[PDB]
Protein backbone atom coordinates (compact mmCIF):
# COMPACT_ATOMS: atom_id res chain seq x y z
CA UNK A 1 0.00 0.00 0.00
CA UNK A 2 1.55 3.25 -1.20
CA UNK A 3 0.07 6.31 0.51
CA UNK A 4 3.04 8.69 0.52
CA UNK A 5 2.55 9.13 -3.22
CA UNK A 6 -1.12 9.93 -2.60
CA UNK A 7 -0.13 12.56 -0.03
CA UNK A 8 2.25 13.97 -2.64
CA UNK A 9 -0.76 14.15 -4.95
CA UNK A 10 -2.78 16.10 -2.40
CA UNK A 11 0.05 18.56 -1.75
CA UNK A 12 0.48 19.25 -5.43
CA UNK A 13 -3.28 19.60 -5.94
CA UNK A 14 -3.49 22.16 -3.14
CA UNK A 15 -0.54 23.99 -4.65
CA UNK A 16 -2.00 24.17 -8.14
CA UNK A 17 -5.43 25.05 -6.78
CA UNK A 18 -4.04 27.92 -4.74
CA UNK A 19 -1.99 29.38 -7.56
CA UNK A 20 -4.53 28.96 -10.37
CA UNK A 21 -7.50 29.95 -8.23
CA UNK A 22 -5.92 33.13 -6.94
CA UNK A 23 -4.72 34.07 -10.41
CA UNK A 24 -7.86 33.28 -12.38
CA UNK A 25 -10.35 34.64 -9.88
CA UNK A 26 -8.27 37.76 -9.49
CA UNK A 27 -8.55 38.24 -13.22
CA UNK A 28 -12.28 37.55 -13.15
CA UNK A 29 -12.99 39.85 -10.22
CA UNK A 30 -11.00 42.56 -11.96
CA UNK A 31 -12.75 42.07 -15.30
CA UNK A 32 -16.33 41.63 -14.11
CA UNK A 33 -16.22 44.11 -11.24
CA UNK A 34 -14.32 46.94 -12.89
CA UNK A 35 -13.64 46.48 -16.60
CA UNK A 36 -17.07 45.63 -17.94
CA UNK A 37 -20.44 47.09 -17.02
CA UNK A 38 -22.81 45.38 -14.59
CA UNK A 39 -25.40 43.08 -16.14
CA UNK A 40 -27.45 40.40 -14.44
CA UNK A 41 -24.96 37.92 -15.86
CA UNK A 42 -21.81 39.76 -14.85
CA UNK A 43 -23.01 40.50 -11.33
CA UNK A 44 -23.65 36.78 -10.99
CA UNK A 45 -20.28 35.70 -12.34
CA UNK A 46 -18.68 38.28 -10.06
CA UNK A 47 -20.27 36.76 -6.99
CA UNK A 48 -19.01 33.33 -7.94
CA UNK A 49 -15.57 34.79 -8.56
CA UNK A 50 -15.52 36.45 -5.13
CA UNK A 51 -16.79 33.35 -3.38
CA UNK A 52 -14.03 31.29 -4.91
CA UNK A 53 -11.28 33.90 -4.68
CA UNK A 54 -11.52 34.29 -0.93
CA UNK A 55 -11.44 30.53 -0.42
CA UNK A 56 -8.54 29.95 -2.81
CA UNK A 57 -6.56 32.72 -1.15
CA UNK A 58 -7.07 31.09 2.22
CA UNK A 59 -6.03 27.64 0.98
CA UNK A 60 -2.34 27.94 2.06
CA UNK A 61 -3.46 27.87 5.68
CA UNK A 62 -4.60 24.34 4.89
CA UNK A 63 -1.35 23.63 3.10
CA UNK A 64 0.58 24.45 6.26
CA UNK A 65 -1.53 22.14 8.42
CA UNK A 66 -1.11 19.30 5.96
CA UNK A 67 2.65 19.83 5.76
CA UNK A 68 3.11 20.29 9.51
CA UNK A 69 0.92 17.36 10.51
CA UNK A 70 -2.20 18.03 12.48
CA UNK A 71 -1.17 21.34 14.02
CA UNK A 72 -2.26 24.96 13.85
CA UNK A 73 0.74 27.27 14.43
CA UNK A 74 -1.46 30.36 14.16
CA UNK A 75 -3.60 32.19 16.68
CA UNK A 76 -7.14 31.77 17.88
CA UNK A 77 -8.37 34.56 15.61
CA UNK A 78 -7.02 32.80 12.62
CA UNK A 79 -8.55 29.43 13.35
CA UNK A 80 -11.80 31.32 13.81
CA UNK A 81 -11.29 33.50 10.72
CA UNK A 82 -9.97 30.91 8.28
CA UNK A 83 -12.58 28.24 8.83
CA UNK A 84 -15.35 30.82 8.68
CA UNK A 85 -14.03 32.46 5.52
CA UNK A 86 -13.61 29.02 3.96
CA UNK A 87 -16.99 27.65 4.88
CA UNK A 88 -18.83 30.81 3.84
CA UNK A 89 -17.22 30.65 0.45
CA UNK A 90 -17.03 26.96 -0.33
CA UNK A 91 -20.66 26.86 0.40
CA UNK A 92 -22.06 30.01 -1.11
CA UNK A 93 -20.13 29.06 -4.24
CA UNK A 94 -22.14 25.91 -4.79
CA UNK A 95 -25.24 28.05 -4.26
CA UNK A 96 -24.09 30.60 -6.80
CA UNK A 97 -23.40 27.85 -9.33
CA UNK A 98 -26.90 26.53 -8.78
CA UNK A 99 -28.27 30.06 -9.17
CA UNK A 100 -26.45 30.56 -12.45
CA UNK A 101 -27.86 27.31 -13.79
CA UNK A 102 -31.35 28.36 -12.73
CA UNK A 103 -30.90 31.77 -14.32
CA UNK A 104 -29.88 30.21 -17.64
CA UNK A 105 -32.83 27.85 -17.59
CA UNK A 106 -35.29 30.65 -16.98
CA UNK A 107 -33.61 32.86 -19.57
CA UNK A 108 -34.26 30.22 -22.21
CA UNK A 109 -37.51 28.60 -21.08
CA UNK A 110 -39.38 31.84 -20.32
CA UNK A 111 -38.21 34.51 -22.73
CA UNK A 112 -41.28 36.59 -21.95
CA UNK A 113 -40.73 36.62 -18.21
CA UNK A 114 -37.04 37.44 -18.46
CA UNK A 115 -37.86 40.10 -20.98
CA UNK A 116 -40.21 41.76 -18.50
CA UNK A 117 -38.77 41.06 -15.08
CA UNK A 118 -35.14 39.94 -15.20
CA UNK A 119 -33.45 43.22 -14.31
CA UNK A 120 -30.40 44.16 -12.27
CA UNK A 121 -32.64 45.23 -9.40
CA UNK A 122 -34.07 41.73 -9.17
CA UNK A 123 -30.56 40.32 -9.43
CA UNK A 124 -29.37 42.36 -6.47
CA UNK A 125 -32.41 41.27 -4.48
CA UNK A 126 -31.89 37.59 -5.31
CA UNK A 127 -28.10 37.50 -4.96
CA UNK A 128 -28.50 38.01 -1.22
CA UNK A 129 -30.05 34.54 -1.19
CA UNK A 130 -26.92 32.43 -1.63
CA UNK A 131 -24.86 34.53 0.75
CA UNK A 132 -27.45 34.64 3.52
CA UNK A 133 -28.02 30.90 3.19
CA UNK A 134 -24.27 30.29 3.36
CA UNK A 135 -23.94 32.43 6.48
CA UNK A 136 -26.91 30.73 8.10
CA UNK A 137 -25.48 27.29 7.46
CA UNK A 138 -21.95 28.22 8.49
CA UNK A 139 -22.94 29.58 11.91
CA UNK A 140 -21.70 26.29 13.45
CA UNK A 141 -18.21 27.10 12.18
CA UNK A 142 -18.39 30.63 13.56
CA UNK A 143 -19.31 29.27 16.97
CA UNK A 144 -17.57 26.00 17.82
CA UNK A 145 -14.23 25.90 16.05
CA UNK A 146 -11.90 27.13 18.79
CA UNK A 147 -8.31 25.93 18.74
CA UNK A 148 -7.67 22.84 20.84
CA UNK A 149 -4.35 21.41 22.08
CA UNK A 150 -3.08 17.92 21.35
CA UNK A 151 -2.49 15.09 23.80
CA UNK A 152 0.89 14.27 22.27
CA UNK A 153 1.60 18.02 22.29
CA UNK A 154 0.34 20.23 19.48
CA UNK A 155 -2.59 22.52 18.71
CA UNK A 156 -5.01 21.98 15.84
CA UNK A 157 -8.20 23.41 14.34
CA UNK A 158 -11.26 21.25 14.93
CA UNK A 159 -14.77 21.60 16.32
CA UNK A 160 -15.09 21.95 20.07
CA UNK A 161 -18.76 20.89 20.18
CA UNK A 162 -18.44 20.77 23.96
CA UNK A 163 -16.55 23.68 25.54
CA UNK A 164 -17.53 22.05 28.81
CA UNK A 165 -15.31 18.97 29.20
CA UNK A 166 -16.90 16.43 31.52
CA UNK A 167 -16.12 13.04 29.97
CA UNK A 168 -14.39 11.68 26.86
CA UNK A 169 -17.40 9.48 26.08
CA UNK A 170 -19.89 12.33 26.47
CA UNK A 171 -17.61 14.49 24.33
CA UNK A 172 -17.60 11.80 21.64
CA UNK A 173 -21.37 11.46 21.77
CA UNK A 174 -22.06 15.17 21.43
CA UNK A 175 -19.46 15.57 18.69
CA UNK A 176 -20.90 12.59 16.82
CA UNK A 177 -24.46 13.88 16.97
CA UNK A 178 -23.56 17.39 15.89
CA UNK A 179 -21.27 16.07 13.16
CA UNK A 180 -24.05 13.86 11.82
CA UNK A 181 -26.33 16.88 11.65
CA UNK A 182 -23.56 18.77 9.89
CA UNK A 183 -23.00 15.97 7.39
CA UNK A 184 -26.68 15.62 6.57
CA UNK A 185 -26.97 19.35 5.95
CA UNK A 186 -23.81 19.25 3.85
CA UNK A 187 -24.95 16.40 1.62
CA UNK A 188 -28.55 17.51 1.14
CA UNK A 189 -28.24 21.29 0.82
CA UNK A 190 -24.82 21.36 -0.81
CA UNK A 191 -24.89 18.42 -3.20
CA UNK A 192 -28.44 17.15 -3.50
CA UNK A 193 -29.92 20.57 -4.26
CA UNK A 194 -27.30 22.19 -6.53
CA UNK A 195 -26.95 18.91 -8.41
CA UNK A 196 -30.69 18.87 -8.59
CA UNK A 197 -31.00 22.43 -9.91
CA UNK A 198 -28.03 22.16 -12.25
CA UNK A 199 -29.11 18.81 -13.69
CA UNK A 200 -32.76 19.80 -14.09
CA UNK A 201 -32.15 23.30 -15.41
CA UNK A 202 -29.63 22.09 -17.93
CA UNK A 203 -31.72 19.15 -19.07
CA UNK A 204 -34.56 21.58 -19.75
CA UNK A 205 -32.30 23.77 -21.88
CA UNK A 206 -31.14 20.68 -23.76
CA UNK A 207 -34.69 19.56 -24.45
CA UNK A 208 -35.75 23.00 -25.61
CA UNK A 209 -32.77 23.40 -27.92
CA UNK A 210 -33.08 20.01 -29.62
CA UNK A 211 -36.89 19.86 -29.66
CA UNK A 212 -37.44 23.30 -31.15
CA UNK A 213 -34.20 23.37 -33.16
CA UNK A 214 -33.23 26.95 -32.37
CA UNK A 215 -29.48 26.42 -32.77
CA UNK A 216 -27.68 25.16 -35.85
CA UNK A 217 -24.40 24.71 -33.97
CA UNK A 218 -23.78 22.22 -31.18
CA UNK A 219 -21.68 24.49 -28.98
CA UNK A 220 -24.31 25.35 -26.33
CA UNK A 221 -24.85 21.68 -25.63
CA UNK A 222 -21.08 21.40 -25.19
CA UNK A 223 -20.36 24.42 -22.98
CA UNK A 224 -23.42 23.40 -21.01
CA UNK A 225 -22.23 19.82 -20.70
CA UNK A 226 -18.77 20.90 -19.58
CA UNK A 227 -19.96 23.30 -16.91
CA UNK A 228 -22.33 20.67 -15.59
CA UNK A 229 -20.03 17.65 -15.70
CA UNK A 230 -17.08 19.56 -14.25
CA UNK A 231 -19.18 20.62 -11.29
CA UNK A 232 -20.30 17.03 -10.87
CA UNK A 233 -16.91 15.35 -11.22
CA UNK A 234 -15.22 17.88 -8.97
CA UNK A 235 -17.68 18.16 -6.12
CA UNK A 236 -19.04 14.61 -6.26
CA UNK A 237 -16.25 12.37 -4.90
CA UNK A 238 -15.81 14.61 -1.89
CA UNK A 239 -19.51 14.60 -1.10
CA UNK A 240 -19.67 10.81 -1.40
CA UNK A 241 -16.69 10.19 0.85
CA UNK A 242 -17.98 12.87 3.22
CA UNK A 243 -21.31 11.10 3.57
CA UNK A 244 -19.48 7.81 4.06
CA UNK A 245 -17.41 9.36 6.83
CA UNK A 246 -20.48 10.93 8.40
CA UNK A 247 -22.03 7.47 8.57
CA UNK A 248 -18.83 5.92 9.95
CA UNK A 249 -18.05 8.92 12.13
CA UNK A 250 -17.83 7.55 15.68
CA UNK A 251 -15.39 4.91 14.49
CA UNK A 252 -13.06 7.31 12.69
CA UNK A 253 -13.12 9.53 15.76
CA UNK A 254 -12.08 6.48 17.79
CA UNK A 255 -8.82 6.17 15.87
CA UNK A 256 -9.87 3.41 13.47
CA UNK A 257 -11.35 2.97 10.04
CA UNK A 258 -8.12 4.68 9.08
CA UNK A 259 -7.23 6.02 5.57
CA UNK A 260 -10.65 7.60 5.33
CA UNK A 261 -8.79 10.66 6.56
CA UNK A 262 -6.44 10.44 3.60
CA UNK A 263 -9.42 9.94 1.31
CA UNK A 264 -11.13 13.03 2.70
CA UNK A 265 -7.94 15.03 2.30
CA UNK A 266 -7.35 14.00 -1.30
CA UNK A 267 -10.96 14.40 -2.43
CA UNK A 268 -11.22 17.76 -0.68
CA UNK A 269 -8.22 18.73 -2.75
CA UNK A 270 -10.27 18.10 -5.89
CA UNK A 271 -13.38 19.80 -4.56
CA UNK A 272 -11.32 22.88 -3.79
CA UNK A 273 -9.77 22.44 -7.22
CA UNK A 274 -13.17 23.11 -8.77
CA UNK A 275 -12.97 26.67 -7.47
CA UNK A 276 -9.94 27.42 -9.62
CA UNK A 277 -11.41 26.45 -12.99
CA UNK A 278 -14.85 27.88 -12.26
CA UNK A 279 -13.65 31.18 -13.79
CA UNK A 280 -12.49 29.28 -16.86
CA UNK A 281 -15.77 27.43 -17.34
CA UNK A 282 -18.18 30.23 -16.60
CA UNK A 283 -16.47 33.49 -17.42
CA UNK A 284 -13.55 32.67 -19.71
CA UNK A 285 -15.50 30.27 -21.90
CA UNK A 286 -17.41 33.13 -23.49
CA UNK A 287 -15.87 35.25 -26.22
CA UNK A 288 -16.72 38.62 -24.67
CA UNK A 289 -14.86 37.97 -21.43
CA UNK A 290 -11.79 36.61 -23.21
CA UNK A 291 -11.78 39.69 -25.40
CA UNK A 292 -12.04 42.01 -22.40
CA UNK A 293 -9.12 40.20 -20.78
CA UNK A 294 -7.02 40.53 -23.93
CA UNK A 295 -7.89 44.20 -24.42
CA UNK A 296 -7.02 45.01 -20.81
Amino acid sequence: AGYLFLDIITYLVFAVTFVLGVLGNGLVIWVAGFRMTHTVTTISYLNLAVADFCFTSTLPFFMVRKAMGGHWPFGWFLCKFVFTIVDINLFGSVFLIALIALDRCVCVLHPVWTQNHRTVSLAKKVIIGPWVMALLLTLPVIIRVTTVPGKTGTVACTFNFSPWTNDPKERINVAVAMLTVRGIIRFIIGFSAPMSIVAVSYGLIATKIHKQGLIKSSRPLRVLSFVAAAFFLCWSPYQVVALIATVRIRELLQGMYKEIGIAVDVTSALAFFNSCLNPMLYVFMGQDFRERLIHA
Binding site: L90, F91, G190, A242, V264, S268
Partner: peptide, 4 residues
Amino acid sequence: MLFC
Protein backbone atom coordinates in the same frame (compact mmCIF):
# COMPACT_ATOMS: atom_id res chain seq x y z
CA MET B 1 -18.93 22.34 3.80
CA LEU B 2 -15.58 21.30 5.14
CA PHE B 3 -15.12 18.09 7.04
CA CYS B 4 -13.53 18.37 10.47
